[PDB]
Scaffold this active site. Structure first.
Site, PDB file in Angstrom:
ATOM      1  N   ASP A  65      43.499  37.581  51.359  1.00  0.00           N
ATOM      2  CA  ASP A  65      43.360  38.877  50.731  1.00  0.00           C
ATOM      3  C   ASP A  65      43.787  39.993  51.719  1.00  0.00           C
ATOM      4  OD1 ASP A  65      42.258  38.224  48.236  1.00  0.00           O
ATOM      5  OD2 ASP A  65      40.593  37.350  49.296  1.00  0.00           O
ATOM      6  N   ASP A  90      39.855  30.330  50.671  1.00  0.00           N
ATOM      7  CA  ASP A  90      40.104  31.616  51.336  1.00  0.00           C
ATOM      8  C   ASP A  90      40.297  31.487  52.795  1.00  0.00           C
ATOM      9  OD1 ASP A  90      39.630  32.573  48.782  1.00  0.00           O
ATOM     10  OD2 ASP A  90      38.012  33.919  49.344  1.00  0.00           O
ATOM     11  N   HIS A 122      44.340  42.796  44.396  1.00  0.00           N
ATOM     12  CA  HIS A 122      43.193  42.683  43.497  1.00  0.00           C
ATOM     13  C   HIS A 122      41.812  43.017  44.119  1.00  0.00           C
ATOM     14  CE1 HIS A 122      44.073  38.659  45.177  1.00  0.00           C
ATOM     15  NE2 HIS A 122      42.754  38.558  45.226  1.00  0.00           N
ATOM     16  N   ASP A 140      43.523  34.540  41.989  1.00  0.00           N
ATOM     17  CA  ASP A 140      42.317  35.362  42.132  1.00  0.00           C
ATOM     18  C   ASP A 140      42.194  36.672  41.316  1.00  0.00           C
ATOM     19  OD1 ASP A 140      40.321  36.406  44.979  1.00  0.00           O
ATOM     20  OD2 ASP A 140      39.701  35.333  43.227  1.00  0.00           O
ATOM     21  N   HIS A 157      44.233  31.316  50.598  1.00  0.00           N
ATOM     22  CA  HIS A 157      44.150  32.605  49.924  1.00  0.00           C
ATOM     23  C   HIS A 157      43.849  33.697  50.978  1.00  0.00           C
ATOM     24  CE1 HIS A 157      43.774  35.310  46.614  1.00  0.00           C
ATOM     25  NE2 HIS A 157      42.555  35.663  46.968  1.00  0.00           N
TER      26      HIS A 157
HETATM   27 ZN   LIG Z   1      41.543  37.376  46.460  1.00  0.00          ZN
END
Ligand SMILES: [Zn+2]
Ligand SMILES: *[C@H]1O[C@H](CO)[C@@H](O)[C@H](O)[C@H]1NC(C)=O
Length: 1014
Positions: A62, A311, A441, A174, A60
């Protein structure tokens, strides 16, 4: 066309119904804390029916959160991708899925050619698989569907071009809660499957017990089921390894081989992973297979999905090895031990879904149908994630502004092919990508660290500047005699003028049109209307003299009103919030009339005295102890008085009454109708002194909100023939009610300043008998019925209000439309409330590591529509959707896609023309050209232009239809050679259209068309 109003879809699971029935008890279910001890029949699987297990590695990433996009890319992501390239290249059986294309494109572009070829190869051969393929994994609560489509397209266009693949499976692990807007767009973009993770723990429990975690998710109004998209909801509390191998995190943690010491990670359940060996592989497999079989009981086929990631995982080469080798030992033992009747292997997301559907097709399972959404999410106890529906509201508002500028920029420049030197493509691509990135997000959600929020803001600011450059070059070309048109592609022919962003009191950013007999007698201004219908709207400009008249390009006078420029000051000396009028600049206001998707030119001319067609507003300052308010040359003296109730009526519009504090108290629709009680009130929520603290994610109020103590606020009343308003300086909010003849516009200049642990809410109190029902929209795409549930805590009854909300009874409806996503609710019959800003001193344990203490002044805008609905054909009581009226829908459009205004920047515009698009078809009011984008550069022999056409559904309330022409977007540009219906991303042709005509779409439907021109 399906009827989206009168037929209630029959579905196996309807989320509002399910919510009405579920108890939501938060019981300790044992190792599966929010479930129960899953039991299975060991004989279910056997030699003839094995459990096929797909372990899907993932990471993951971000695109900004606690580091900025670039910091994560430098510190983590480029290493993760560089190592994935190498490890997959070297281990043909290893697999990996990738979601965020913003990072992938950043990486790929930096790769040398040899590595790009290697990368294309492991994608082409199936080892590296893109899931969703959007620029980001967007937020699904605050995001507008238009931006969700934009970012999906941005990432997928990049993938098609460089990787030659288009994902048909989506992965969203997420976002905080999930919206049916995603399958809606995905299913119209070629997708066949999707996976979601963050849904309420009670919903997971409930659907797991019924084996309804996999379902055909259709839209709430879809009776037939053609919008259906197969969806897999993960069962557990997190997408991390401890919560994805089965019910017991203490066991699953032992199979995250990165938690052994050297990596600085460990298992909080206190049993660490152990390297797999010939001596422990049977016992380790005994444990793992047992978790797998328990997880399998929650689904209907013999194909099991086992995500393996967390993550920013798979960063170090040693990490790739430790995960891969240990799992390979487990698979070799497990697949050769017949008594487990399991075949496990690494796989990709598409492989999982393909196998699931092969089981389905073999008649092994039938899946339930479902409609509804998955808000508001709670990951545990009473920790409902409704705070982020409001966090960092300045940027949530900025998102809608940029949304519209990107659309206007792409649309205005689409009309022509541009030389590469104009750098149109380059500026648009930057703008689309920064807005697409913000859909992440942790972007629009307001859940990033302060310096990351700043990064997104700076990126969005450059995107706004890029849109402006493109828009202004486009206007100059569209309205200048061709043989005179002489562009300098770096020159600013026009300055955009935006009255609501950053907004008065937020930034002094608007230019004053400076006129004077000794300097410049007049100025051309141009309005653009991105909507595909003729539109009139009042527009205002600042001018250096109050004696200005307006004319159109045929030189016909246009009635105008001049008002003062008022700014509110929190006066630190008198300790009052009061307005000061400019003595050097004034506001001229007039009604612009603009063609569908077109432009209209006007001229502002100075005169030595009051011009014949310009009127002046009167102004009244209400407060005790007033002082003079001189306004330079303004011709009407400001009047003063003690605070008192007042009433105003513009045009034939409604009559609004305000309390002596300057707040709305009633609306009277027609001259003798009742003064309907509609009261604005501002309140505050606090934070709990013991227990969990509200943070960027969580809203954990310490009880119902308490009224903001207003004191005796200063109220300014401006009354004009075209526009009147009532403004009041309240603590933290300059609240303004503006009237132009229809539903009022409300603007709140919100400065929560240093009020810690405070959330400011704006509430409407009416006597509408709405009971426990209210409606809020999902991504500005549809309205869904909400039912206030007293069995849930207050924060759970808060929902995303991305663009509007309403309450109604049999006769009356009150709709509040927003120019920005905010959180809100109806906590009592007859009420509506929406949070303005929140400032929290504490972190709320979701990893952000800070509270929200970076608030800044923001100008929230709204339209407030009170209507009689007794004559409207509405859905039945059991229907889960609601629909706007024509007026509420137009009011929403006036906030999200207002006219754009341009001021000619030099003294004289040679070759200026008065209008563009007078021949564009003015389409029916429920239809919109959401996107108009030229898809080819100028060197392409066959030019292509893509259009996204969306039709909403408006209630039939007895107003006769009227006029309108059919809109065929394929003939908007000349020399059309071909018209094709395509997926929404324009990446796949779905239909060759006869006569090169693009048919309009059905209510609530969205189609994309591409016209090719010779
Ligand atoms: Zn995330
Ligand atoms: C990739 O696109 C499709 C999918 O494999 C294929 O038919 C085509 O030959 C490929 N084109 C390439 C390798 O660029």
């Amino acid at each position: 066309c399906q009827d989206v109003v009168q037929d209630v879809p029959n579905v196996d699971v309807q989320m509002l119904e399910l919510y009405d029935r579920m108890s939501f008890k938060d019981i300790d279910g044992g190792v599966w804390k929010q479930g129960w001890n899953i039991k299975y029949d060991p004989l279910k699987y056997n030699a003839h029916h094995k459990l096929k297990v797909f372990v899907v590695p993932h990471s993951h990433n971000d695109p900004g959160w606690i580091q900025t996009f670039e910091e994560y890319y430098q510190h983590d992501t480029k290493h993760i991708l560089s190592n994935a390239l190498r490890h997959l290249h070297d281990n043909p059986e290893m697999k990996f899925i990738w979601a965020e294309i913003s990072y992938f494109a950043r990486f790929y572009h930096d790769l040398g050619e040899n590595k790009k070829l290697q990368m294309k190869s492991i994608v082409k051969n199936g080892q590296l698989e893109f899931v969703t393929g959007g620029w980001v994994m967007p937020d699904e609560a605050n995001s507008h569907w238009r931006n969700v489509l934009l970012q999906l397209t941005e990432g997928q266009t990049w993938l098609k071009q460089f990787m030659n693949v288009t994902p048909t499976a989506s992965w969203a692990i997420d976002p905080f809660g999930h919206s049916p807007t995603m399958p809606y767009i995905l299913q119209k973009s070629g997708f066949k499957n999707m996976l979601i993770q963050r849904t309420h723990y009670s919903v997971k429990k409930e659907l797991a017990q019924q084996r309804q975690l996999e379902f055909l998710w259709r839209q709430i109004w879809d009776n037939k089921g053609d919008t259906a998209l197969f969806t897999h909801m993960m069962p557990f509390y997190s997408y991390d390894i401890p919560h994805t191998c089965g019910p017991d995190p203490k066991v699953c943690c032992q199979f995250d081989f990165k938690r052994m010491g050297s990596f600085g990670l460990s298992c909080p359940w206190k049993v660490p992973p152990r390297t797999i060996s010939d001596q422990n592989v049977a016992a380790r497999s005994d444990l793992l297979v047992d978790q797998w079989k328990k997880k399998a009981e929650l689904y209907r086929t013999n194909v099991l999905l086992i995500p393996l990631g967390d993550d920013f995982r798979f960063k170090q080469n040693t990490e790739w090895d430790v995960q891969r080798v240990n799992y390979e030992r487990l698979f070799e033992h497990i697949n050769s031990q017949a008594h487990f009747n399991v075949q496990a292997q690494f796989g990709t997301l598409q492989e999982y879904f393909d196998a699931v559907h092969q089981a389905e097709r073999a008649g092994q399972a039938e899946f339930p149908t479902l409609s509804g959404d998955f808000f508001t999410y709670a990951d545990r106890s009473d920790n409902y994630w409704s705070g982020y529906y409001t966090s960092r509201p300045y940027h949530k508002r900025m998102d809608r502004v940029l949304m519209h500028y990107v659309r206007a920029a792409e649309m205005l420049s689409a009309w022509h092919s541009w030389d590469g030197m104009a750098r149109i493509e380059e500026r648009l691509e930057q703008a689309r990508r920064e807005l697409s990135l913000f859909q992440h997000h942790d972007g629009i959600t307001g859940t990033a660290k302060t310096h990351v929020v700043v990064d997104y803001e700076q990126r969005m600011q450059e995107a706004l500047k890029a849109c402006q450059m493109v828009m202004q070059q486009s206007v100059y070309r569209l309205l200048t005699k061709p043989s005179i048109y002489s562009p300098d592609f770096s020159f600013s022919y026009f300055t955009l003028d935006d009255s609501r962003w950053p907004g008065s009191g937020v930034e002094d950013s608007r230019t004053t049109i400076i006129l004077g007999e000794d300097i410049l007698p007049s100025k051309h201004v141009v309005m653009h209307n991105t909507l595909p219908h003729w539109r009139e709207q009042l527009v205002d400009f600042y001018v250096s003299s109050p004696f200005v008249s307006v004319t159109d390009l045929a030189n016909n006078p246009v009635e105008a009103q001049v008002s003062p420029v008022w700014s509110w000051h929190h006066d630190t000396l008198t300790k009052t919030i009061h307005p000061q009028g400019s003595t050097t600049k004034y506001r001229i206001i007039f009604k612009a009339r603009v063609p569908p998707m077109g432009l209209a030119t006007y001229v502002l001319t100075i005169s030595d005295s009051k011009p014949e067609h310009t009127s002046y507003a009167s102004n009244l300052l209400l407060r005790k102890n007033p002082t003079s308010l001189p306004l330079g040359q303004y011709p009407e003296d400001v009047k003063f008085g003690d605070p008192r109730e007042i009433s105003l009526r513009v045009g034939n519009g409604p009559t609004l009454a305000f309390s002596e504090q300057g707040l709305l108290k009633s609306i009277q629709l027609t001259q003798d109708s009742p003064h309907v009680p509609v009261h604005f009130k501002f309140l505050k929520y606090g934070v709990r002194s013991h227990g969990d603290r509200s943070g960027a994610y969580l809203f954990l109020p310490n009880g119902p909100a308490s009224p903001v103590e207003l004191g005796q606020p200063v109220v300014l009343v401006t009354k004009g023939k075209l526009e009147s308003s009532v403004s009041v300086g309240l603590p933290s909010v300059v609240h303004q009610t503006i009237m132009r003849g229809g539903a009022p516009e409300i603007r709140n200049l919100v400065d929560i300043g240093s009020l810690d642990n405070t959330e400011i809410v704006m509430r409407l109190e009416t006597h509408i008998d709405s009971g426990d029902i209210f409606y809020t929209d999902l991504n500005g795409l549809q309205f869904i019925k909400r039912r206030r549930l007293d069995k849930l805590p207050l924060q759970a009854n808060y929902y995303p209000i991305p663009s509007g909300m309403f309450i109604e009874d049999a006769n009356t409806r009150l709709t509040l439309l927003t120019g920005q996503p905010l959180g809100g609710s109806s906590l009592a019959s007859g009420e509506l409330e929406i949070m303005q800003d929140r400032r929290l001193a504490s972190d709320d344990e979701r990893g952000l590591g800070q509270g929200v203490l970076d608030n800044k002044p923001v100008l929230h805008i709204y339209r407030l529509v009170l209507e009689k609905v007794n004559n409207c054909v509405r859905p039945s009581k059991l229907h889960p959707a609601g629909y706007l009226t024509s007026a509420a829908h137009k009011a929403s459009q006036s906030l999200l896609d207002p006219l754009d205004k341009f001021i000619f920047a030099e003294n004289e515009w040679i070759g200026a023309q008065g209008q563009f698009g007078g021949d564009h078809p003015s389409a029916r009011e429920d239809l919109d050209v959401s996107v108009m984008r030229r898809l080819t550069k100028s060197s392409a022999k066959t030019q292509r232009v893509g259009y996204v056409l969306h039709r909403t559904n408006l209630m039939q309330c007895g107003t006769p239809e009227e006029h309108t022409q059919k809109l065929d977007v394929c003939h908007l540009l000349p020399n059309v050679a071909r018209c094709e219906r395509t997926t929404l991303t324009f990446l796949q042709n779905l239909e060759h259209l006869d006569g090169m005509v693009a048919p309009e779409v059905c209510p609530m439907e969205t189609a994309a068309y591409v016209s090719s021109h010779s």
